Amino acid sequence: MADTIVAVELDSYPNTDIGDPNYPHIGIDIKSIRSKSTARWNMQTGKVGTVHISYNSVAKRLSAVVSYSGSSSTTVSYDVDLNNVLPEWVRVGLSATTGLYKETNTILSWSFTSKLKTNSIADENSLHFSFHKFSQNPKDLILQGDAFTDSDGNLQLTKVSSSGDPQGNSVGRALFYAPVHIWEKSAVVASFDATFTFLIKSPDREPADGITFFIANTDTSIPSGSGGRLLGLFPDAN
Amino acid sequence: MADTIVAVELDSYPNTDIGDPNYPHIGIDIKSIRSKSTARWNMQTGKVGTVHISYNSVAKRLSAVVSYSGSSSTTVSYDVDLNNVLPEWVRVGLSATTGLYKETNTILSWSFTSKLKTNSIADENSLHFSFHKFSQNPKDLILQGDAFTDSDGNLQLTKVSSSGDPQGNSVGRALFYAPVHIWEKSAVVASFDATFTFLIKSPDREPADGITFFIANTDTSIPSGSGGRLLGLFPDAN
Amino acid sequence: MADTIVAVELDSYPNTDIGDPNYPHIGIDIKSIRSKSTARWNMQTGKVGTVHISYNSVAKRLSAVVSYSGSSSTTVSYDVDLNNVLPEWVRVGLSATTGLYKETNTILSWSFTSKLKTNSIADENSLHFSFHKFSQNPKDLILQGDAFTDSDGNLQLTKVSSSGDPQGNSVGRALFYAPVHIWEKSAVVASFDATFTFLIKSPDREPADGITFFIANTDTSIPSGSGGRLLGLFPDAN
Amino acid sequence: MADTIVAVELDSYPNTDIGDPNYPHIGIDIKSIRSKSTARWNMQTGKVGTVHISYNSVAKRLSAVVSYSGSSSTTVSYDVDLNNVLPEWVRVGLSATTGLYKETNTILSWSFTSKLKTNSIADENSLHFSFHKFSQNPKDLILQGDAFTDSDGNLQLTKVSSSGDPQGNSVGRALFYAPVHIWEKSAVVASFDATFTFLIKSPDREPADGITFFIANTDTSIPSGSGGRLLGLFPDAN
Ligand SMILES: OC[C@H]1O[C@H](Oc2c[nH]c3ccc(Br)c(Cl)c23)[C@@H](O)[C@@H](O)[C@@H]1O
Ligand SMILES: OC[C@H]1O[C@H](Oc2c[nH]c3ccc(Br)c(Cl)c23)[C@@H](O)[C@@H](O)[C@@H]1O
Ligand SMILES: OC[C@H]1O[C@H](Oc2c[nH]c3ccc(Br)c(Cl)c23)[C@@H](O)[C@@H](O)[C@@H]1O
Ligand SMILES: OC[C@H]1O[C@H](Oc2c[nH]c3ccc(Br)c(Cl)c23)[C@@H](O)[C@@H](O)[C@@H]1O
Ligand SMILES: [Ca+2]
Ligand SMILES: [Ca+2]
Ligand SMILES: [Ca+2]
Ligand SMILES: [Ca+2]
Ligand SMILES: [Mn+2]
Ligand SMILES: [Mn+2]
Ligand SMILES: [Mn+2]
Ligand SMILES: [Mn+2]
Numbered sequence: 001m002a003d004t005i006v007a008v009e010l011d012s013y014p015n016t017d018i019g020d021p022n023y024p025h026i027g028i029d030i031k032s033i034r035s036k037s038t039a040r041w042n043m044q045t046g047k048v049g050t051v052h053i054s055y056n057s058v059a060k061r062l063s064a065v066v067s068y069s070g071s072s073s074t075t076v077s078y079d080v081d082l083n084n085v086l087p088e089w090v091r092v093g094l095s096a097t098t099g100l101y102k103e104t105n106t107i108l109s110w111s112f113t114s115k116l117k118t119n120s121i122a123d124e125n126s127l128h129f130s131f132h133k134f135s136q137n138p139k140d141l142i143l144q145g146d147a148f149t150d151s152d153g154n155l156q157l158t159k160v161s162s163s164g165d166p167q168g169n170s171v172g173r174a175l176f177y178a179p180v181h182i183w184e185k186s187a188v189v190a191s192f193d194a195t196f197t198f199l200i201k202s203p204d205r206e207p208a209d210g211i212t213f214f215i216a217n218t219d220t221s222i223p224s225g226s227g228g229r230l231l232g233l234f235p236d237a238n
Numbered sequence: 239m240a241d242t243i244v245a246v247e248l249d250s251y252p253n254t255d256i257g258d259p260n261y262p263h264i265g266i267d268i269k270s271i272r273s274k275s276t277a278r279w280n281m282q283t284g285k286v287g288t289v290h291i292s293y294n295s296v297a298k299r300l301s302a303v304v305s306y307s308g309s310s311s312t313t314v315s316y317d318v319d320l321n322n323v324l325p326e327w328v329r330v331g332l333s334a335t336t337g338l339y340k341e342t343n344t345i346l347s348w349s350f351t352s353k354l355k356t357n358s359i360a361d362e363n364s365l366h367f368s369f370h371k372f373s374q375n376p377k378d379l380i381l382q383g384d385a386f387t388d389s390d391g392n393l394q395l396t397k398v399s400s401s402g403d404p405q406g407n408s409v410g411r412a413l414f415y416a417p418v419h420i421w422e423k424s425a426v427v428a429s430f431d432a433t434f435t436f437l438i439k440s441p442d443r444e445p446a447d448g449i450t451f452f453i454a455n456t457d458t459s460i461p462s463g464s465g466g467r468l469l470g471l472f473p474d475a476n
Numbered sequence: 477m478a479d480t481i482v483a484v485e486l487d488s489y490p491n492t493d494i495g496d497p498n499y500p501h502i503g504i505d506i507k508s509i510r511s512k513s514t515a516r517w518n519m520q521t522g523k524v525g526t527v528h529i530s531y532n533s534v535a536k537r538l539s540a541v542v543s544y545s546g547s548s549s550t551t552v553s554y555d556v557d558l559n560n561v562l563p564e565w566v567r568v569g570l571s572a573t574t575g576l577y578k579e580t581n582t583i584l585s586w587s588f589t590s591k592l593k594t595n596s597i598a599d600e601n602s603l604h605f606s607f608h609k610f611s612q613n614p615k616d617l618i619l620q621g622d623a624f625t626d627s628d629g630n631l632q633l634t635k636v637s638s639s640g641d642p643q644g645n646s647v648g649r650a651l652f653y654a655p656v657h658i659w660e661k662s663a664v665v666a667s668f669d670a671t672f673t674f675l676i677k678s679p680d681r682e683p684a685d686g687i688t689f690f691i692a693n694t695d696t697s698i699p700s701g702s703g704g705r706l707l708g709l710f711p712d713a714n
Numbered sequence: 715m716a717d718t719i720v721a722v723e724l725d726s727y728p729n730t731d732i733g734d735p736n737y738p739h740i741g742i743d744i745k746s747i748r749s750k751s752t753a754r755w756n757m758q759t760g761k762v763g764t765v766h767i768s769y770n771s772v773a774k775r776l777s778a779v780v781s782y783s784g785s786s787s788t789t790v791s792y793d794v795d796l797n798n799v800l801p802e803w804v805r806v807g808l809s810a811t812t813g814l815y816k817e818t819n820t821i822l823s824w825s826f827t828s829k830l831k832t833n834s835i836a837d838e839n840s841l842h843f844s845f846h847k848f849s850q851n852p853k854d855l856i857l858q859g860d861a862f863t864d865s866d867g868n869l870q871l872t873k874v875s876s877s878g879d880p881q882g883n884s885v886g887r888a889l890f891y892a893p894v895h896i897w898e899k900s901a902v903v904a905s906f907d908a909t910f911t912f913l914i915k916s917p918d919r920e921p922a923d924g925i926t927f928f929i930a931n932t933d934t935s936i937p938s939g940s941g942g943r944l945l946g947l948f949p950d951a952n
Contacts, residue, residue, distance in 0.1 A: 673834060
């Protein structure tokens with residue numbers, strides 16, 4: 001069967017033939033590339049941006065905010081019970097693609113916290129990780145497809161040359177090595193927060209295709225046919 | 239000039255004359271004792287209970303859950319922008335009352351985290367405290383009214399005897415000593431999370447009146463007339 | 477080549493033939509079962525104990541303390557630079573054995589934090605995990621030898637029957653799934669802290685053999701001949 | 715009665731007068747301006763530096779490292795039992811002075827964590843704060859002497875002009891608002907960690923006088939005569 005995917009997308013390229021709004025946008029994706037909720041994103045190609053993502057099983061609202069130094073922020077939210085969508089054990093990761101058009105999909109930092117609180121207090125679990133730059137040989141990441149860490153310590157999700165020039169038709173993903181426990185039958189509340197900073201540079205008039213933070217089944221792998229507009233996440237546009 | 243109050247109430251006594259539902263309930267109170275959202279609380283007098291509260295400014299949803307070991311939990315949420323309600327600097331606290339009827343309002347643990355973020359993975363401001371014991375001299379709490387720490391290390395918000403028998407017509411509150419910064423001009427996202435565990439015992443067959451977590455202006459005090467049904471928060475029932 | 481091991485041992489059985497003092501002891505082991513430092517441990521068989529372990533690269537002192545409710549604590553320290561000992565990437569874990577004599581090697585909770593700092597604030601890493609009780613399918617743990625999680629949610633490092641009776645000649649370990657990055661060429665300061673709570677029960681007049689927290693090369697596995705007095709860590713007593 | 719002081723000094727100006735070494739140095743001060751331990755400071759006037767300080771009560775080792783974007787590292791350590799020196803409740807803070815000679819004493823960030831542990835994985839008391847910008851009205855800091863926050867959001871501990879030139883004969887301190895519980899009768903282990911980033915700039919051939927992180931009785935205030943060489947911390951040079 002296909003993987004089960006929940007994602008927040010920073011979608012730089014409007015694919016209106018598969019339901020994208022006709023502008024760069026942020027979106028919340030629940031098992032489909034066709035986002036349940038979107039907000040218009042005013043990209044600053046060449047500038048370092050920041051994304052903050054949060055979810056709590058009591059509120060049942062997955063939210064995301066994108067900002068840049070000295071600019072107005074873009075926000076997006078969706079009401080959803082993640083226990084009905086995802087398995088109890090997941091992996092978390094970042095993905096990016098290029099297609100006919102291209103961009104650098106550079107990650108400068110990534111942090112993530114999750115918590116599982118139950119009935120009994122001494123029945124609980126937490127996981128936190130934080131990367132400010134990345135090791136050249138990162139043993140706590142599963143790197144998939146074209147993803148790699150360059151000589152500056154930056155995570156490049158898609159291909160770039162030695163001079164830093166991006167390449168088209170590229171796909172890559174980075175997953176945290178340990179599975180994450182996001183629900184159980186006795187749980188009272190589960191929550192997570194994620195942050196990443198990113199640098200999209202591009203020589204193209206319309207940069208493409210984007211970067212996601214995603215949560216999937218533990219054995220998730222890049223699907224066949226998921227390049228370009230499908231963001232390395234989905235086998236089709238349904 | 240009255241305080242500005244946001245609270246989560248565990249209201250054990252139905253004051254139907256001032257808009258309570260006719261059962262013990264959990265509520266979200268925005269500037270009034272008359273809750274904007276309530277849910278049925280299945281009290282278990284004599285068992286240790288746990289409350290988890292959370293908010294973030296992108297989701298704009300204040301939510302709370304109450305539970306006991308081996309039991310079903312109760313949730314309540316309300317969509318609100320706290321920027322629009324509270325001043326930028328606050329104190330946070332726990333309050334409790336008894337009236338004609340009575341209960342012990344015993345706090346066994348209390349923790350709190352607030353974050354103010356912008357454009358990096360590290361937060362521009364964060365505060366975290368956690369008490370699992372309470373000290374015989376809590377120099378980091380402002381104790382108001384009948385609130386005191388006992389010989390067992392527990393925090394008693396209202397009057398109780400040597401023998402563990404609660405008293406009627408009591409009011410008590412405990413505030414964390416340092417002001418918390420909950421928004422600013424430059425802010426991208428602000429969030430907070432709080433947890434407390436409580437023991438409510440009663441000789442009566444109808445215990446009263448309840449316990450809250452609340453957030454207020456920094457100079458907040460127990461208002462004249464806030465006994466019983468007003469939970470030590472409000473000077474009247476409007 | 478053999479594994480590289482740094483460990484804190486709760487050594488319940490004196491094997492004076494390989495240099496144990498003639499009493500139960502807590503020990504710091506650096507690449508040998510023969511401890512670099514020991515202290516007398518006053519065991520309370522059948523009671524839940526707590527161990528706290530810490531280290532940072534400026535102080536260069538690895539310390540551990542073992543305690544029980546109502547008792548006084550025993551401490552042990554050793555001055556060592558852990559980088560000259562350990563590789564840059566490690567796994568962290570828990571190990572236990574039994575031999576001719578036996579005990580339960582039960583883990584009720586385990587937490588770990590590591591941090592690696594430079595000065596970019598944006599060149600760095602942290603990892604934190606916390607388990608209060610353990611899942612029936614612990615996908616974030618690598619279980620080795622006889623280790624398993626039971627119906628109560630406890631981690632059993634060595635064999636116990638369904639009635640909870642321990643078995644002799646057992647060895648088991650549990651490793652956190654993700655590698656930990658503990659040094660790099662640009663590092664200024666690296667630190668770690670670990671906590672575990674444990675329950676050692678035994679029908680034997682002299683219980684054996686003990687429990688350790690350990691740090692090893694990422695590919696560590698139970699050496700042949702590490703049963704009993706070698707605590708699942710070393711292939712010989714050198 | 716005088717304040718009770720424990721400090722880590724970054725001392726830019728040798729006062730051989732009162733027992734400084736005859737070079738710029740970092741030091742550990744236990745109840746006297748006359749450091750119990752010093753190290754020659756690998757100083758870089760005009761560069762952003764970072765200080766990390768740590769202590770735990772099992773190891774009994776107070777340690778500090780000062781570095782500059784990864785280079786030019788200096789360390790200092792002292793074996794000491796702080797339960798014998800400090801009261802159980804304290805305030806923590808930063809101080810700085812100029813005298814005949816001068817430098818900017820600029821704080822760009824500051825964080826602190828304190829923990830008091832016993833018999834579990836969850837701590838019985840913890841406190842954590844973090845500032846990466848400082849507020850125009852920082853209600854959670856007690857600002858003493860010349861200390862103010864500037865339009866950039868930096869904390870200036872001593873007088874600086876509107877353009878950016880430091881003034882002589884100035885003193886300033888910033889204390890965190892809430893008292894900190896550092897030890898108790900039945901504590902198993904107490905620990906704290908602090909980090910700050912600073913910028914010392916000077917038009918002088920020989921900058922003065924330095925910056926400290928310190929720990930004091932909760933009621934601490936700038937003593938009379940503690941200018942220049944006494945770092946705003948001590949009334950005399952005894
Ligand atoms: O990278 C931008 C887009 O490039 C391709 O789609 C096209 C967008 N504009 C075009 C113009 C001509 C042709 Br042929 C193609 Cl395939 C496209 C495809 O690779 C899409 O998946 C992708 O989103
Ligand atoms: O503790 C329960 C309640 O007791 C008091 O109200 C009454 C409850 N039963 C009554 C019966 C008669 C009269 Br008069 C009163 Cl005020 C009450 C008041 O103290 C209320 O504020 C409180 O909610
Ligand atoms: O569990 C206690 C000990 O049992 C064995 O060693 C012995 C301890 N007392 C003995 C008495 C007789 C014989 Br045979 C043996 Cl092997 C032992 C061995 O399994 C040791 O590794 C272990 O430490
Ligand atoms: O700012 C650096 C120093 O300047 C002063 O000490 C002197 C250093 N050189 C001098 C030369 C003359 C005189 Br008068 C004085 Cl007080 C000093 C005093 O203000 C000292 O406390 C301070 O350490
Ligand atoms: Ca698209
Ligand atoms: Ca009521
Ligand atoms: Ca032994
Ligand atoms: Ca000096
Ligand atoms: Mn899209
Ligand atoms: Mn009510
Ligand atoms: Mn031993
Ligand atoms: Mn000095």
